[PDB]
Design a protein around this ligand. Structure first.
Ligand SMILES: O=C(O)c1c[nH]c2c(S(=O)(=O)F)cccc2c1=O
Ligand SMILES: *S(=O)(=O)c1cccc2c(=O)c(C(=O)O)c[nH]c12
Ligand SMILES: *S(=O)(=O)c1cccc2c(=O)c(C(=O)O)c[nH]c12
Length: 435
């Protein structure tokens, strides 16, 4: 398949729903390449678990862990890694308050070439067990031949853009990976990189990151159709940030404005998919899945206007309605949801920290965190749109992993709010939630 977009395997679904899914052990297997060194960009790590996911014959190859931890959190990560002489650590600089390193990426250097994996899962057992997570697998990139005079660049500019993303860390261990990427031919890449890095971006640099990056790509490489105002926007995420006192403060003024861009010329329905309390309670994990669905009561009660946009998690199409989402996706379906104009899988949740918030009279985009995703545009595949994969077939599509159209919350539903108790009905393991 051309998209190379995969879900993680889910323990408990019938085999039909895992056959085209990937476990971390599959990604790292010798069949994917003969590993010589890897970099693991992530947020949370279980180092003992992680090393066991590599094939035994590769467990002593160098591993770089790229993380954002500080102070005692950083001390705990170093303590986890110290038994493994081959593991080095790179602490991503986070010079803006409340910033985090959320990017999930593997750089896998092989004897045969290079592979890039951009995904949504932490490097801990629970994130690959019973959650809905997304994976983009790059091709095996070959080394550029000696005396060849190739850029190795793709029509999507992925090679330069990935190097640009790495340069933002200003890290010597990542300059080593930049030099590796320079040596490889990434020209087959058919996705666009969309990253966020911490900073305050002005002028030209405004288009490099966050939701302005998305807007620029949609302006440059998508075309606007008639009736485009009827094509909804869908956002699907596992955390909700503080968005302001009303939808005009950020959600519909700059976030939706970036996401509704199509083409270069100058009322759109907005669907937000986020697990309800009932979604979480009846999930495979039960209430403990809500430990990975951060939405504070303190934030929620200041933006009740938001919840009228909320739709339940439903994923019959991939057998994953009870596998809570830690994937984040954004897309532009047609009014009947049979086609999409583009699809994005990313780490970025529905938050200003991840996507950026305009400052200084609209002239500066401020981003707190590292985020990373990849954008699927029909034009990159010679197509005008993507047909949508669904559960029902009457009888070759983009594999949207959840059901369309999204289903509105019922009047008795509530968004999952992780730091209040739920003691009225037990979860699938027989337990309540008392935070
Ligand atoms: O964008 C995001 O998804 C998030 C960003 N920050 C968080 C923090 S914070 O202490 O770093 F402000 C604490 C808890 C959850 C989140 C979160 O979910
Ligand atoms: S390469 O095969 O070594 C090659 C072949 C033709 C021309 C050049 C060239 O002009 C340069 C340069 O630095 O300008 C390098 N390699 C070339
Ligand atoms: S961290 O950014 O402070 C943090 C802490 C707990 C849980 C999460 C979380 O679930 C996510 C997510 O994308 O779901 C991100 N950061 C977290």
């Amino acid at each position: 398949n051309p998209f190379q977009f995969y879900l993680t395997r889910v323990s408990g679904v019938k085999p039909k729903y895992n056959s085209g899914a990937l476990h971390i052990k599959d990604i790292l297997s010798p069949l994917f390449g003969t590993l010589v060194s890897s970099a693991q960009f992530n947020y949370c790590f279980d180092v003992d678990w992680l090393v066991k996911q590599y094939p035994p014959e590769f467990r002593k190859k160098p591993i770089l862990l790229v993380h954002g931890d500080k102070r005692e959190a950083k001390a705990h990560l170093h303590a986890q890694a110290k038994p493994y002489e081959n593991i080095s650590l790179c602490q991503a600089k986070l010079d803006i308050a409340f910033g985090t390193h959320h990017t999930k990426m593997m750089l896998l250097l092989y004897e045969e070439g290079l592979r890039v994996v951009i995904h949504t899962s932490n490097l801990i057992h629970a994130d690959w067990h019973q959650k809905t997570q997304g994976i983009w697998l790059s091709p095996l990139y070959p080394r550029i031949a000696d005396g060849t005079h190739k850029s190795g660049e793709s029509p999507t500019h992925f090679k330069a853009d990935l190097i640009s993303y790495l340069m933002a860390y200003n890290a010597p261990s990542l300059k080593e990976w930049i030099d590796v990427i320079h040596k490889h031919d990434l020209s087959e890449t058919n996705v666009y990189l969309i990253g966020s890095t911490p900073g305050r971006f002005q002028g030209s640099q405004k288009d490099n990151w966050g939701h302005f990056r998305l807007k620029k790509l949609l302006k440059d490489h998508a075309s606007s159709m008639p009736n485009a105002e009827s094509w909804p926007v869908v956002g699907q995420f596992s955390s909700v940030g503080s968005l302001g006192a009303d939808e005009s403060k950020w959600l519909c003024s700059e976030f939706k404005e970036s996401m509704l861009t199509l083409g270069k010329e100058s009322s759109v329905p907005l669907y937000l998919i986020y697990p309800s309390v009932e979604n979480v309670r009846t999930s495979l994990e039960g209430y403990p899945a809500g430990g990975s669905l951060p939405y504070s009561i303190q934030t929620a009660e200041k933006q009740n206007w938001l919840h009228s946009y909320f739709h339940k998690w439903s994923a019959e199409t991939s057998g994953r309605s009870n596998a809570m989402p830690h994937i984040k996706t954004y897309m532009r379906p047609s009014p009947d949801f049979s086609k999409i104009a583009w699809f994005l899988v990313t780490s970025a949740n529905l938050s200003k920290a991840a996507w950026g918030a305009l400052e200084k009279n609209g002239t500066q985009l401020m981003i707190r965190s590292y985020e990373l995703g990849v954008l699927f545009l029909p034009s990159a595949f010679g197509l005008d749109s993507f047909k949508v994969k669904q559960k029902f077939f009457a009888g070759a599509t983009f594999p949207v992993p959840y059901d369309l159209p999204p289903e509105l919350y019922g009047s008795k539903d509530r968004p999952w709010i992780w730091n209040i108790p739920y003691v009225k009905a037990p979860d699938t393991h027989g337990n309540m939630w008392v935070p």
